[model samples]
Target: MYEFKDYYQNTVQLSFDDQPFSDSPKHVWVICRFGGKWLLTEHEDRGYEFPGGKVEPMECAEEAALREVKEETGARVKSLKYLGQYKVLGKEKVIVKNIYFADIEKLEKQADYFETKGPVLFHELPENLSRNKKFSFIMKDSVLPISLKKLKESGWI
Candidate 1:
């Protein structure tokens, strides 16, 4: 449950009680697991967060999810399931994202990680993610918490 009244009265939130209205969203977010641990990426600038990014014009959401995970963490998606969606409401724009869960089959070494330092595996995240400044905003407050809870409820975590 991530709720913050920041960004000049704009709201940053995460919810799992319902699904988003957009059938094909332009953005995506993912929660990945492998070998009974969480698979995460370390952005050189954004600190620790799940692998996600914009969905390319020609690519569908699921395709983009796998591509992003590969590009960011070098993890291959052996199997995946639709988890849930989330959004950010603000004066600038409304960002709609489709969420998914990935069970990675293998991790390949990347010649270069781009802006990412590399992948990090954790048995569990810190209980107070926001308090840990290492985590990025929506990632710590919204995505991580909501995703972990829902995944656990679904018996995936």
Candidate 2:
């Protein structure tokens, strides 16, 4: 298990396994890649982060991932692979996020990028995202390294 702190200073546990944190997971997080670069979404208030959000009721996790990528970045995921799960042990509720790795084939004009401004393509993960002020989403920083590690292990990166 990997341990990190959330934006609210709550404890979070990340696991690269198939076990769900609960019977049903309500959240989904995705890391998208295209042309050997990473795709990051610029959240309205949280700055740059991966495309992810709550899994709408009656929908599956993979559907949520695809919908989030389309809504936040306008990127079409040609392929998707499940990676793992993460849990935020908060005071109010325990949040579980289903993690995924996606390969984006193309982009489109996202006039309705609601919470996200747009998508930025990076040839590599930023070397100084931790020190950068604009990259305000700390939670994403925690999972990114692990995701890269998993990709490396799978010979995908």
Candidate 3:
């Protein structure tokens, strides 16, 4: 059976049944929170980004977002709200990332299952993140401040 993990890793190559890559690959973002702190993933090259993946065949964008969140955080999430969408113009493909915001209320006991090297919560991002321009643009343009505003308005923080 083709699992979610397989789909995520090969998203750029795979196409959904109804929507081909020509239509646009649907991406998702999973924002995780623990103890009043947000969690961000560090790529092997030291780029910082949210836990996200592309939507698979017969899968909705929200489902993909939730699945990626669980896969990446090892935590159960609740109350995911649709934030918005943006097109990331990469050399290989033009990706339509469907951004969603969620609050992680509980942590799973087995954190080791999530295959990540560096997961950190800092009041301010470290200098290492500066090296990643796309990440910086995403943070500056969309993710961080918007999430804070959403959380505050919802009175979750």
Candidate 4:
């Protein structure tokens, strides 16, 4: 099992050795559009974020991402493609994160937004998405671009 270390009240650090485990952990984010804008989620404590979660021991990252999309958005998605990976260096730990982008083929047009608090579409990336404040593993650039390129090369885009 992996144990996360607390380097600060606002952040946790995983040991350097644990860094390799990140490749196996798996994670996914849903880059969705609502009202012609990007959809983001805000946890009660954490501010806005792309919908995603860690992969279970029994599941691969792709599967974990698919499950996270459904849990967070109530949307059925398919055609997931790899985006890229990122690394976060903390005082006592190094965190590695794998990023995947998935497309939601069928979305409920009139779904109630309040069913999930802070789930909203933004016309632009919010100013508050600073590196220290957002998820430790998000890459500086948008993952969608890389994913789109890979898909096109593979004839999936």
Candidate 5:
């Protein structure tokens, strides 16, 4: 378990244990790799970040992860693994989000990526993500680094 305040000053608690929080997670963040590069989407407003969004009313977290990747980046997931989850103590509402590591199958160009500008591939994530104006607050938090560390420890990276 890890706890820290995010860029917005919201308290966030992260855990490798599945669904550690009492509330069911309603959001998902997916870390995807394809052709030896990381997959990210350029959000129209939020800047660059991984594929993720609010889970639809009837959708599960896993499905949301897969759907978000496809909708935002046009990348198909070959296999998916649950990495961890985090709960954010936000001022507006408490948000619980599931984290996933996805092995991408292939990319299929889409006419529209919703609010995103399709895929932006990276061979490596910049070390100074927080200082980069091109990235989103989601990438500026501990969630990503911790998740990547967990993936490395698991021999996935």
Candidate 6:
């Protein structure tokens, strides 16, 4: 339940309700937890961010979420639940993304992590995340805090 402007000045509207955007959102992002630590992927270009990407043409949002996490972090998702959605309203086009909360069963070693450097774990999300240059702009937005609040309220923490 937040609205703000992204780094690119795109209007970002967030809701902590399941499938708040579209039933078939084109994008997916997952907040992954493994061994009591949070999982983030070091995108070669975007720096550190959570696992996510565009949904494949033949895949649903959930499948894309799981694939992206595995491809980026080599983490096997044990179980996941829909958490929220955020829509980015840009000048040219609008993007609807579904957010998920996932628990990891194990990490599988891989020779490569696609375009990312691989998984980065944090015992706790840092206080200065918004100002943390090491993180991607996605993590420096209101969506993160809002979704995190919902996650805590869900009593899964």
TM-score of every candidate: 0.86, 0.91, 0.63, 0.57, 0.96, 0.95
Q: Quantify all predictions' global Cα lDDT against the true fold.
A: 0.78, 0.83, 0.57, 0.52, 0.91, 0.90
> What are the clashing pairs of model 2?
none
Per-residue lDDT of model 2, residues 19-115, tens digit only: 5576578999888898888898888898888889999887889999999999999999899988899888888988898888999999998668888
Off by over 4 Å in 4: 1-23, 108-118, 127-157
The candidate with the higher TM-score, 4 or 5, is: 5
- Give, for candidate 6, the lowest lDDT window spanning 10 residues: 16-25
Instruction: Note each model's CA RMSD in angstroms.
Output: 2.6, 1.6, 9.1, 7.4, 1.0, 1.2
- Cα lDDT tens digits, model 1, 50-141, are 88889888998989998888988999888888887777776878877878899999999989777787788878877777777787565645
Evaluate residue 74 in candidate 4 and report its C-alpha lDDT on the 0 to 100 scale. 60
Q: Which runs of model 2 end up more than 4 angstroms from their true locations? A: 139-141
Which window of ten consecutive residues has the lowest lDDT sum in model 3?
A: 1-10
For model 4, name the residue pairs that clash.
none
Clashes of 3: 0
**Residue ranges of candidate 6 with Cα displaced over 4 Å:** none
Runs of candidate 1 exceeding 4 Å displacement? 1-9, 13-19
What C-alpha lDDT does candidate 5 achieve relative to the native structure? 0.91
Candidate 5, residues 1-157: lDDT per residue as tens digits?
9999999999999999988984568899999999789999999998999999998879988889999999999998999999999999999999899999998999997999999999999999988789999998999989988899898898775
Q: Point out the worst 10-residue segment of candidate 1 by lDDT.
A: 1-10
TM-score winner: 5
For each candidate, how many residue pairs have backbone atoms clashing (under 3 Å)?
0, 0, 0, 0, 0, 0
